[PDB]
Design a protein around this ligand. Structure first.
Ligand SMILES: [Zn+2]
Lengths: 43, 93, 168, 171
């Protein structure tokens, strides 16, 4: 038993990173994340 | 058996092909006589090993390039005679 | 049934090894057996008897009737009846020997192209400039047992004579 | 076998040919293409009979290219070789596999395996000849050949025969 092997960080890390990249919460949800519009400060 | 296609200008024939290719017109033309050559140019053990290896490099936070170099390495060793053992822990490390 | 037994022994000599021949002879010694009787009779196991039984099932060599002994003591009785069927064996042996003779009774190829040509292709492949058969795409040269099959056929001929004797 | 048959053919005039004399042009293209050509179905086309009575039918124009198409019904003599047929021929080319028999427009090949045992190849002769126990097969020599098989291809024909059997061999 060694803690580093027991806990796998990319589970959480790459999980969230993935989700926000694709914006699919599951599909059970999609398009939740969207790249910001910098067209104009109003936009 | 043969099957290799080469492009040659029947009117020039002077050299082997020296040509340019036009992607927009999707055609390929001899640069000399300006003739069109072509048209309509179109646009079990292992997997287990790489799985646990993947886990290890992951926990180690090594960048994918390192992970993949090690993967490549391990494939070359694989089942070879001279290794003759080491139980799969030594090889992964 | 001596002639049929001799034909079966010849088939055992031709087809498979000696253990199958011995099992057939053991079935010949005892009139009828049910699914467990070869195991009591033989030192081989039931799982391995099963591979041999599957091999017999692959061919027409013998026949199986599937019968239950009805009397209601526990689950009753699974008794299998293995009885040789002579007509199916005769038909299969004749088909095999005739097919074997047909195979024994039964050309141009290019080394680099690995293609294959025939006599009609010979008329096409002939060139007037040289004297040779030339390949189609690669224009490569063209290049290209029975007596031994006949000797093995001498073994087949004794079996055919035995079949004729069994017929008449 | 030299036969005669009524044959149909479709022809295409480039527009520039449409002058009143065009029918002549039709008969011209007909003769040029048809005579001397081969067709896998009817054999080698030899000569066109009944030149004057050729039926023009009615010329249809097709879609783009504007070229007039026609259907010509004519009567002509053609040669169709057949399997199990006995023919006579004069050798032209000689190979170790056999000598190539010229029968009419058609070049028939005979395999050495289709030749009798006594018949042997000779490369020590100029040209190479087949010297049997009696007959000697050379280029200008005449040989009676029964055709064993025929291969018919669209636009061409080629075939095989054997002098092995009786009433065959050198003429
Ligand atoms: Zn060019």
């Amino acid at each position: 038993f060694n803690m580093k092997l027991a806990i796998n960080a990319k589970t959480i890390t790459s999980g969230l990173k993935y989700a926000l990249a694709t914006g699919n919460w599951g599909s059970s949800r999609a398009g939740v994340s969207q790249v910001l519009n910098r067209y104009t400060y109003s936009s | 058996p043969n099957l290799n296609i080469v492009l040659t200008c029947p009117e020039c024939k002077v050299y082997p092909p020296k040509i340019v290719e036009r992607f927009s017109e999707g055609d390929v033309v001899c640069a000399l006589c300006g003739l069109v050559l072509s048209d309509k140019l179109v646009d079990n053990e292992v997997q287990a090993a790489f799985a646990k290896i993947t886990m290890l490099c992951d926990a180690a936070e090594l960048p994918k390039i390192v992970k993949d170099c090690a993967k490549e390495a391990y494939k070359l060793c694989h089942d070879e005679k001279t290794l003759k053992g080491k139980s799969m822990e030594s090889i992964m490390a | 049934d001596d002639i049929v037994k001799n034909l079966l022994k010849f088939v055992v000599r031709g087809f498979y090894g000696g253990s199958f021949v011995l099992v057939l002879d053991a079935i010949l010694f005892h009139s009828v057996l049910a699914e467990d009787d070869l195991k009591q009779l033989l030192s081989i196991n039931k799982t391995e008897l099963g591979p041999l039984i599957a091999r017999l099932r692959s061919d027409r060599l013998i026949s199986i009737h599937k019968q239950r002994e009805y009397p209601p003591n526990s689950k009753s009785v699974e008794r299998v009846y293995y009885y040789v069927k002579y007509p199916h064996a005769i038909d299969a042996i004749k088909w095999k020997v005739h097919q074997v003779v047909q195979r024994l009774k039964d050309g141009y190829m290019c080394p680099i192209c690995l293609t294959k040509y025939t006599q009609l292709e010979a008329v096409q492949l002939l060139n007037f400039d040289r004297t040779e058969f030339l390949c189609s795409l690669c224009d490569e040269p063209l290049v290209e047992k029975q007596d031994k099959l006949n000797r093995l056929m001498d073994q087949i001929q004794p079996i055919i004579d035995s079949l004729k004797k069994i017929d008449d | 076998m030299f036969f005669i048959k009524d044959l149909s053919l479709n022809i295409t005039l480039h527009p520039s040919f449409f002058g009143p004399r065009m029918k002549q042009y039709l008969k011209t293209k007909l003769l040029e293409e048809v005579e001397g050509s081969c067709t896998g179905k009817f054999g080698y086309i030899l000569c066109v009979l009944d030149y004057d009575n050729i039926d023009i039918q009615r010329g249809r124009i097709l879609p783009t290219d504007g070229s007039a198409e026609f259907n010509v019904k004519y009567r002509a003599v053609v040669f169709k070789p057949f399997k199990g047929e006995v023919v006579d021929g004069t050798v032209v080319s000689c190979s170790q596999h056999g000598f190539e028999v010229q029968v009419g427009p058609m070049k028939v090949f005979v395999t050495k395996h289709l030749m009798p045992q006594d018949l042997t190849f000779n490369a020590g002769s100029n040209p190479p000849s087949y010297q049997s126990s009696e007959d000697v097969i050379t280029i200008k020599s005449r040989i009676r050949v029964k055709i064993e098989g025929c291969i018919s291809q669209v636009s061409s024909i080629h075939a095989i025969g054997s002098i092995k059997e009786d009433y065959l061999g050198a003429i």
